[PDB]
Description:
The structure is cut from a larger assembly and holds chains A, B, C and D.
Chain B (H helix, E strand, L loop, with lengths): L4 H4 L11 E2 L18 E7 L12 E5 L10 E4 L4 H6 L3 E5 L1 H9 L6 E4 L4 H4 L24 H9 L2 E5 L5 E8 L7 H14 L12 E6 L4 E3 L1
Parallel strand pairs in B: 1-10, 4-5, 4-6
Antiparallel strand pairs in B: 2-8, 2-9, 3-7, 9-10
Chain C lengths: L18 H9 L7 H4 L32 E2 L2 E4 L2 E4 L2 E2 L9 H10 L6 H13 L6 H11 L7
Antiparallel strand pairs in C: 1-4, 2-3
Helix pairs in contact in C: 3-4
Chain D lengths: L7 E6 L4 E6 L5 E6 L13 H11 L12 E5 L4 H11 L7 E3 L17
Parallel strand pairs in D: 1-4, 4-5
Antiparallel strand pairs in D: 1-2, 2-3
Helix pairs in contact in D: 1-2
The structure holds two RNA strands.
Protein name (chain A): Small ribosomal subunit protein bS21
GO biological process, one term (chain A): ribosomal small subunit assembly
Subunit structure (chain A): Part of the 30S ribosomal subunit. In stalled ribosomes contacts ribosome rescue factor SmrB.
Amino acid sequence: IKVRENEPFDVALRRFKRSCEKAGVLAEVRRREFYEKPTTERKRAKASAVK
Amino acid sequence: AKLTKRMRVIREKVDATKQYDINEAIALLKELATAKFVESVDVAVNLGIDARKSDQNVRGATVLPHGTGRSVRVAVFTQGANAEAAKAAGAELVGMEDLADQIKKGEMNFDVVIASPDAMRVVGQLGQVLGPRGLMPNPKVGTVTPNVAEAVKNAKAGQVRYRNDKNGIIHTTIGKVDFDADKLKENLEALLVALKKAKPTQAKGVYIKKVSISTTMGAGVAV
Amino acid sequence: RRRVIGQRKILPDPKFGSELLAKFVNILMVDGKKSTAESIVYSALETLAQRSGKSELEAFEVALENVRPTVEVKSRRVGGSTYQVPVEVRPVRRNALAMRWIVEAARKRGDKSMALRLANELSDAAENKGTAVKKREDVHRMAEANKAFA
Amino acid sequence: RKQVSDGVAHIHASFNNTIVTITDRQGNALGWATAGGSGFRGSRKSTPFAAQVAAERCADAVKEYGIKNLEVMVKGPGPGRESTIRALNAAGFRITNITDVTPIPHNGCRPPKKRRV
RNA sequence: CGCGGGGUGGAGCAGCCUGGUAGCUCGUCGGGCUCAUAACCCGAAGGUCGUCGGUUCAAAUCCGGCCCCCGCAACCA
RNA sequence: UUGAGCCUUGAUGUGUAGGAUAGGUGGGAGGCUUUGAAGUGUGGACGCCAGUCUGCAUGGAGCCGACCUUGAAAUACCACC
């Protein structure tokens, strides 16, 4: 995870709720070097039903 | 140094390096006293003779005009008329089986204990309570004998008892600093000639390595 | 694993209203008779006033407020290997652990009257010497040289 | 020497060791401690206890320098990070400058399932 | 020609300054373990801690002698 | 900068058990403290966790053996090593 956040924490991190297995987070979208591309999709949003 | 006021005022009379002749200092020994208890002059001898081997261990006692610096209260364990002979010679308490209960329970008002050989059957049961006090009689050093009247008198007349310590050293008192300094040169020879007759059987060549003499927490004297 | 269990806190003693005396007669219960234990513990004060026991407010409190156990010993696994590790004593056996250390020390002693062996064991806890009080100290002295694991 | 009331620090924790070092901004050594200096070995040398005791051994090396605030750097993933930072208060320190100095050294990846636990 | 240490079930070693007190490894007779065999672990059986003096309520032990061992050792005509 | 050595200074002693860190060894009851401890607490330090040293709030000549108990054996106050 490689984080630099310091001071007011306990219990040796893993602070994000539902981060691995059966979602969250990512692997939606696991193949072809696109692993971190759904974070970009849900930030460039705008609508999700597009024509 | 760093020294206490009681002794700092005595350095106002005496030199820190000089050891004084016992034939010349005869008015000075009484003059360097400062304590709230009685100060003495004591002899320190270096040995030997072998510094480890217990076959060359030195033990004994010697008679002196003032003994240990006081008179002693002597007790005698003896049955029948021979006890009255020790009571008239130097004993202040006569002992029997009735007294062996008190000594074992813890109470004893005497400096020396003497016994006769047929009375020593009782005293043999006190060897572990009289042991750690040096108070137990033993035939092998003469403190058990039929002539108990002369043995209580030997203690009451004033004697000092000794034995050498670790690595071969021995220390004994030879007078109070207030007592006649003229006699120190006389009584020292009576102590030395008697300690020199106490040489071990397997002693060879030499016996004394060094002699020193000093006052309680005070200056040294020369011979 | 699962469970999550129901637990019991037991009935108080029918003379004094004390549940601490009730747990003491339960640890003193042998052969299931249970009335026998009432006649052994708190059945005399004249036998505690025979030794070190001073006034009735201390005739049972010498097994309660006189001590505080904290840890137990034995080994525990950490990763791929086992180590000697002091473990945290649970907060309701905390006040009822020394009851076994007193009842065992009296029961296994060869000195006749059991009602008197127990009053003598309470007297030897009122001086804070040897039995039960050193069974607290021995494991605390161990845990003062064993701290890396819990 | 003399009172300075200033210094800099380094605190590291891994899954095999933990250490504490205090120095000056002119490069002078002021105090050091390690879990091996605390006398620990093997699977016990990375514990959060081994880190919290080493923190006070370094606070005893700097004791005459007058230091209450020092500029800290933090290294390594190990749980000794959390107890060595709490031990700054048991050392008498109150901080205003602290940064993570751990090498990244590349992008990502794959957070583990062991250590913790 | 001398000195230090040693004498303990079947072989080789403890020690000291807890004197109220025989410890051990190795083997042997048996288990754990094992598909056995190796590696590691621990029950059981058997001896006067030599020997003559000594202190003592008491020494295999300490203090004196002896003897056999194990290591070091020196000189006048 | 330090090897060896000598004075000065300061403290050594907890086999083991509890009230208790009984050094050796010989004495011995009135001897020592007035920035001086007691005693419960926020603190510092060595630790064999018993003890001791220092600081502050304080209170200000005690305290101790003998008594009472523990043990073959003592436990204020002290030479000597």
